[PDB]
Amino acid sequence: KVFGRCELAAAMKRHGLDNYRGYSLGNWVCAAKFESNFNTQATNRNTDGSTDYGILQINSRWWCNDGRTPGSRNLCNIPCSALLSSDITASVNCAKKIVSDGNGMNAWVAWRNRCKGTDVQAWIRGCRL
Ligand SMILES: [Cl-]
Ligand SMILES: [Cl-]
Ligand SMILES: [Cl-]
Ligand SMILES: [Cl-]
Ligand code: NA
């Protein structure tokens, strides 16, 4: 599924991500924009052999199981395929764990490089939320 901007904002709010760990909804929408361009089916292989999955490009190195990432963990206790669903619940649940791990949203390199410090409220501007 490819979400619209406000549509994704609403879905994230519905699943309790707005101001989770102090990160406003615009931060989460911005991260999703630059991680996946709002596409739930996005997958990208990393140089180390792990793969990133879904709207928030969650890595099989630590967070989900894809059966082909040696030495990795599965801390969200989910198959990585679950992070590709049209329903964003599994991605949201796992993102909540990731952002609680110590470094906040810096865990998402695209958030640090493209969202952090910017006018992230622009991402929810005009949205009926
Ligand atoms: Cl957009
Ligand atoms: Cl915001
Ligand atoms: Cl594996
Ligand atoms: Cl980046
Ligand atoms: Na894994």
8 CA → ligand 3 middle, Å: 30
What lies within 8 Å, CB to CB, of 129 at 6+ separation is 6, 9, 10, 13, 18, 25
What CATH number does the domain located at 5-124 have?
Answer: 1.10.530.10
Q: Which residue, 51, 43, 50, 9, is CA-closest to 26?
A: 9
Phi-psi label, residue 116: left if phi above 0, alpha if psi -120 to 50, beta otherwise = beta
Separation of alpha carbons 126 and 55, rounded Å: 22
State the amino acid at position 82 in one-letter form: A
110 CA → ligand 4 middle, Å: 4
Resolution (A): 1.0
52 flagged as catalytic = yes
Going from N- to C-terminal start, the domains of the chain cover 5-124
Which string of b and e fits 46-58 if b means at least 16 CB within 10 Å?
eeeebbbbbbbbb
Full DSSP string of 89-123 = HHHHHHHHHHHTSSSGGGGSHHHHHHTTTS-GGGG
Per annotation, catalytic residue among 7, 18, 52, 119: 52
